[PDB]
Amino acid sequence: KTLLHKYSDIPEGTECHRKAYASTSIGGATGLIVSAYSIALKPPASFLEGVARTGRYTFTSAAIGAIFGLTSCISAQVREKPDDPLNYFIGGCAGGLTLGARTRSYGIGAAACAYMGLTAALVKMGQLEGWQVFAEPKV
Amino acid sequence: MTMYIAFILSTIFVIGFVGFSSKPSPIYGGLGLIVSGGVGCGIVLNFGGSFLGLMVFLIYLGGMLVVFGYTTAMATEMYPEVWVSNKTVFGAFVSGLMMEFCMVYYALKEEEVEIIFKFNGLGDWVIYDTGDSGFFSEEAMGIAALYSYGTWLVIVTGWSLLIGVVVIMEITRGN
Amino acid sequence: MMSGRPGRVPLQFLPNEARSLPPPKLTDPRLVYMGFLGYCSGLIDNAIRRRPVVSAGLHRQLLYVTSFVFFGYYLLKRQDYMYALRDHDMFAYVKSHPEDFPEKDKKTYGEILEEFHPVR
Amino acid sequence: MNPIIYTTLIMTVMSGTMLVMISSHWLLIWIGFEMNLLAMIPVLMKNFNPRATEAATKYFLTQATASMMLMMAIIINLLYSGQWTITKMFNPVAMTMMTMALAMKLGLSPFHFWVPEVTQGISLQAGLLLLTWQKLAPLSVLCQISQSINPNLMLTMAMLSILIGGWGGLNQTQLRKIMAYSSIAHMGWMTAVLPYNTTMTILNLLIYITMTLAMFMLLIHSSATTTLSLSHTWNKMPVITSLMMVTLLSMGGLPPLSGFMPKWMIIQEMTKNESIIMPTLMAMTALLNLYFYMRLAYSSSLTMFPSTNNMKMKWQFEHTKQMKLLPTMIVLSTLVLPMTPALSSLN
Amino acid sequence: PFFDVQKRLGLDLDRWMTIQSAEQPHKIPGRCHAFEKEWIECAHGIGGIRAE
Amino acid sequence: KFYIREPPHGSPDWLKVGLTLGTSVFLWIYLIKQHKEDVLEYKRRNGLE
Amino acid sequence: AGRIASFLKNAWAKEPVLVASFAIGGLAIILPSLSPYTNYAIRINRATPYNYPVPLRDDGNMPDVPSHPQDPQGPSLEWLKNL
Amino acid sequence: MPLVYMNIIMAFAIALAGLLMYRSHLMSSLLCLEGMMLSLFIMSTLIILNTHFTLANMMPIILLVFAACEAALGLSLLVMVSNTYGTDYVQNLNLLQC
Amino acid sequence: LQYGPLAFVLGERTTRKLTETSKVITVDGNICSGKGRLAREIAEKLGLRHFPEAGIHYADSTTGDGKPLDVQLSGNCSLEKFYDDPKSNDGNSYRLQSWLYASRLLQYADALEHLLSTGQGVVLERSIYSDFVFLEAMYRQGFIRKQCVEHYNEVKKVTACEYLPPHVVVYVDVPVPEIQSRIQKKGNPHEMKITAAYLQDIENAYKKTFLPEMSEKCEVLQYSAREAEDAEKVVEDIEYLKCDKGPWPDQDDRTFHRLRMLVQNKLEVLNYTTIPVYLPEITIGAHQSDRVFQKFTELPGRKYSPGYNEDVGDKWIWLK
Amino acid sequence: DGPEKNYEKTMAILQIEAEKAELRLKELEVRRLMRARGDGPWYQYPTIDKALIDHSPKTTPDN
């Protein structure tokens, strides 16, 4: 997971440009996966509509990654908090607000803020700690 | 040349697969596999395996595939697409061409192809073993054990074929 | 886990070592539960088939209770055997690997400084 | 079919899986999978209706392709170790290859779109065979090679089954479709615990098998395939709907019913393996299953539904089939929670 | 085997060809018979996780 | 008699029912016998006998 | 008896190919069992040295194994010679 | 490792892509599924013959005799969807939408 | 033993019992056309099994003690009320017709079971393939509306599909004015004030639909009353016909075993009669249906399975 | 009854609970080490038995 390794290797807050590029790369790659499924299970009319679906989905996902990485890093060193989960909390809502503007709905934007803001803190929450999502079979 | 003959055949084997993997007209797709079936035996033949290779001709190429195209003959629409027809079919063919060209080029220059399985790019012949086989063919004496060691294999494969004969009627009965 | 421990004669519902265990007493609370399940099976069997529930072919109820208890009783023997087997091979590994399970040292609560956090 | 000829097809597939659970050779395992497929196809098309013809085609293409993918997983392992015995795999891509190949035979991850359509087309009696017996054969191999399994590889397959099984189950109407999605959701539970300790994988299998027969043969007695059709059965056979409700609660997972058997131990098992976020998601998303269990429970027995005049005629005649093992299957799937320490027998 | 009826009944169905160092027709070697003899004879009664 | 046709279960299937009690007593007597030899074997092997 | 004999006679009357097939298959399954040369077939089958007769380390106490190939000790296929 | 095996290994992959992608006709898909076991046959024979695994010569003959059983089933199903729908196009096979 | 699949293996084959005199002859016709009379004469001439017209209370005669139950408990529809006023808001028009179709379906099943088991030919008036003429007449005359038609023919599709058409069908075609000529004599108050067009609409729906949709699947031989008294001729035509052009004289023993699977399961043949499609005129409300079922349950014998009701004197219940 | 019944009964209950709790805590440690170094009775994954090898002289002398 070299692509995921980029975000982890760069120190939090420091090197905002590197964090932003890595974070939007993660979002863009994720956008590729979902868009590829969307064309597969639900085909569009022609290829031009297919890239149209890819264009929307990738732009949304890349935007979420870009804004999350930018806000998380720019909030860390400004507040001088390289460990507080709040550095990712406003990042999740930054993506949440970004998604809301992408689909043009206030209600979905607020919900995305609440949900992504919680998960982003939760994802950070495990980074300081030893939380494992795919823990090896020790016992 | 002649040293790379197994490589040469293996190359035709791959492009033969692109012939029917591209899903052309079922008769034409069968033909693309027929040549692919033909060359594949030669790959086996060059390694020994006369009997195992000969089956690919007999019970598969002259066997399974005969009734295959036979079904395509009486089935299918009245307008069979000629290999060019749909631009996707030719797009698939040229797509198959670029995969075998890039690897083979990579194989013969750097010899360090790592795609999925790490494979070093030497000639076909640097893999053969050494030693005399006495007076018995290794392939012939192996599958001749069907009735001396192939005990549980014969009992099960025979039973399923009988079930194969009964399942085909039951599906084709039409209730 | 089990699975392939030394000595695993396959399809052996009761290995010979199980004969060295105290057999489950017929008055076992687990055993009578099997009997209770058998009765509930009998009640459902008459209920599903439009029969007069309790007083409807008590012979079927007897078969259900007997089968559940008998099939139950052999189950506890295997249940107790494997449970005893888990602790048996356990109790020997600790001996063979003493440094893997170091023993703690006696420290009474008079010396242990458990922090006292005030509560308000 | 001819009763004697349907019998052998029913139990050639009985033997096909029986070979898999006893074969120590990789080729022989594929042999049992072949007879598994070769005998499954006719049973799916006992009635010969275009739904069955479609269902057989979808089922055959999926299972055949997975079988072929299984073979090269066998060949690659042979290519790198020259060992035909079933043990831990000696190469990564071979391990990755069969996990997906075995998954498609079972069907949990995106390789699950066949499961709903195939059971919908085929008859209810063949539905239980597909949803109950056809899952021991893939699971037997997975429990065998669980040591070499890739922990990341399996677990993401496990959730994607339960999330898909949990989500899509709400919108389903046909009872077979609901049963299939719950089967997908249940399939995820033991597959997740498979890398850690296969004893709970078998334990979840046995309990899930017991619950599914109780579900399917009761539906067979109801002679209903739609929620509305099942709803009517409250008047003619009120007892069955009451039993329909208890097994729905059981197979929902609420304590002290037997649906709390697998989850609780599975939740406990992974918690010993330090994986604690993982159980919480599955337990919480399991409520998605409970919702359309509640939806079926509401329409079946808890609230009676409008009936038809012609069904007064139904009351005048008694049932014919004896629905063998139904009484013992129901009781063995509702009140076995106090017998939880019996799981030590499996290991 | 998941259900090792092979061992219980004491009758062979599949282990004859499982390894190339087993009995062969007219006693012909399987190329690497010498090496896999050493490995298998290293691994017996050791356990899967240990032997690797 | 009510029903025009004699009903399938109206006549007690004496062969079937007597068999079920036959298994019931056989199943019990083996259970009693099984417990005694198990108890005796445990009494003997574990050193108390 | 009478019907069975008549059954065979009418079987030969209209279906002579199958009764020929069943008779030949019927025989071909049971003479190999009680054959007196089947053991001979096995004996000459093992008496065909595909593989070399690898020598044995002479440690004594074994008189059956010949010291010389032409020595009288050891097995002989004199039976194979006349049959 | 010899390039003849990688030639076979892609041969599975290109066959795998053709089987999964589909264009119009189930005949082609059945053809693609046969290239699957075909490339498996040469790959099996190639390894087994190279290593002189005498008993393993079992598997090549056993492999395709059971793979051909797929053809016995796969070909039969096609004609039934051909008898009822007409052309065996995969797009026709959509009745089980629910 | 019953026809459980074990019995098929060790014995009974349906084809052995079937002979030439194993037809499913149905004698259809207009109202009071003697179709019941003619069917009786034909059946007793050939020694077949005559089945009287499947009424609203026929199902009661097929179970219990052959005692017609209360109309609310056995159909919730009175034919006499329909003849009195079919446009009644209670929906007696379609409710009577739909229940009658189910009555014919049960009547047809019993005839099929007897024919497959005994091998003796069966005779029944009307059919499940002929009840449509009444509703089609009941439609054009304004007795019902479109929704009743949709439910009925859909029930025909989901029930009559696995019931092949009979070997030969007898149609006695009395002219409508002649049927009028006899009904004043009949003197049954409800069935006097029929609409002449409705009985006219009985006849034409019989004319260009019944025979044409039955001719291609079976021989249709037609008479009137003058040949009904002349039944010695209507029977020799049955002898003359080969029973050709029919799907019965080609089925093998396998299908007959499948057919006996369906018929012996009485609820199975009735399973698709009670479609969950909610027609307002036939949908029984939850409270009324629950009370009616409680009324049905408290009836003697119906409380438990047959042979399991000690109320009617079934001893040895404790050891059945 | 007397309070000595409750006192003695409970402390025996506490004693039983302590051994039960201690054994479970030791169990996670025993099972952890077994699955790591694998030199114990259980968790022994299957291996090919040393009896299937054909030790008779082969056709090729060096093999």
Ligand SMILES: CCCCCCCCCCCCCCCCCC(=O)OC[C@H](COP(=O)(O)OCCN)OC(=O)CCCCCCCCCCCCCCCCC
């Ligand atoms: C520090 C490391 C990370 C740094 C970067 C931040 C994280 C990565 C970027 C954010 C990823 C999660 C947010 C969602 C991204 C995908 C959005 C997307 O697919 O949008 C399109 C669409 C929503 O719109 P739609 O419902 O189609 O309505 C319009 C129809 N015309 O989508 C849909 O309809 C489907 C719903 C969305 C797609 C499925 C879920 C995708 C996300 C799963 C989790 C990804 C986690 C990534 C990070 C961890 C792993 C590396």
Ligand SMILES: CCCCCCCCCCCCCCCCCC(=O)OC[C@H](COP(=O)(O)OCCN)OC(=O)CCCCCCCCCCCCCCCCC
């Ligand atoms: C774990 C939590 C609880 C889980 C389960 C909850 C179940 C109920 C939940 C709600 C269900 C939906 C709403 C109600 C549905 C009712 C279903 C039904 O069929 O109701 C009507 C029906 C009428 O009764 P009927 O069939 O005529 O039989 C009467 C007895 N012969 O009624 C019946 O058929 C019911 C018949 C019940 C028969 C009970 C027999 C009791 C026997 C007791 C024996 C005691 C022996 C004691 C021995 C002591 C010494 C050892």
Ligand SMILES: CCCCCCCCCCCCCCCCCC(=O)O[C@@H](COC(=O)CCCCCCCCCCCCCCC)COP(=O)(O)OC[C@H](O)CO
């Ligand atoms: C309706 C949604 C929820 C409503 C509110 C419910 C309560 C909120 C919190 C929910 C807690 C769920 C998880 C708690 C289970 C036990 C966890 C525990 O005991 O604490 C562990 C806390 O560890 C965790 O990571 C536990 C999970 C934390 C939260 C993440 C998952 C829960 C939230 C998402 C799922 C539920 C929300 C709904 C989603 C649809 C300690 O382990 P450790 O991390 O110290 O382990 C040792 C070492 O450090 C290695 O880790």
Ligand SMILES: Nc1nc2c(ncn2[C@@H]2O[C@H](COP(=O)(O)OP(=O)(O)OP(=O)(O)O)[C@@H](O)[C@H]2O)c(=O)[nH]1
């Ligand atoms: N509404 C309605 N009434 C039906 C239907 N089928 C039969 N009937 C009634 O069945 C009753 C008996 O039929 P009739 O023909 O009058 O009987 P019949 O007077 O004995 O005369 P034959 O039938 O010629 O013997 C009549 O009142 C019909 O209206 C149906 O589908 N709908």
